[PDB]
């Protein structure tokens, strides 16, 4: 509706794209690989 005031669509869309997730296992992020010839995965 036109009676609605202007919207900061750039900031709102940045907030949306920054808040929405594709595949998250709940409470995990940043799985990383660090080198004894023992390949391991260090996850936050």
């Amino acid at each position: 509706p036109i009676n609605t005031e202007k919207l900061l669509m750039v900031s709102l869309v940045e907030k949306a794209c920054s808040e929405t997730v594709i595949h998250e296992i709940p409470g995990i992020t940043r799985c990383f690989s660090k080198p004894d010839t023992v390949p391991k995965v260090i996850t936050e």
Partner: protein, 79 residues
Amino acid sequence: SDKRASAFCKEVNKLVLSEVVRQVRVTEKTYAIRLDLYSRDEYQDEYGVLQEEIESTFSNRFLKILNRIIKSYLAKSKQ
């Protein structure tokens, strides 16, 4: 193998739709928003989420989030 190592790594890792979008232009008037998404090749090097996955989750959850935050700001402006 290291290929499966990095595959599982991206698998259990979480990514945010901001991390695949390029600059997002929004034209005013209707009211129109257009997101630029990186080329599927460079997008699949650091990733391995497919195009259809983006399609589905983009549509559903992205519209949910966008409408939710617009309603938040509109209700803030109602006062």
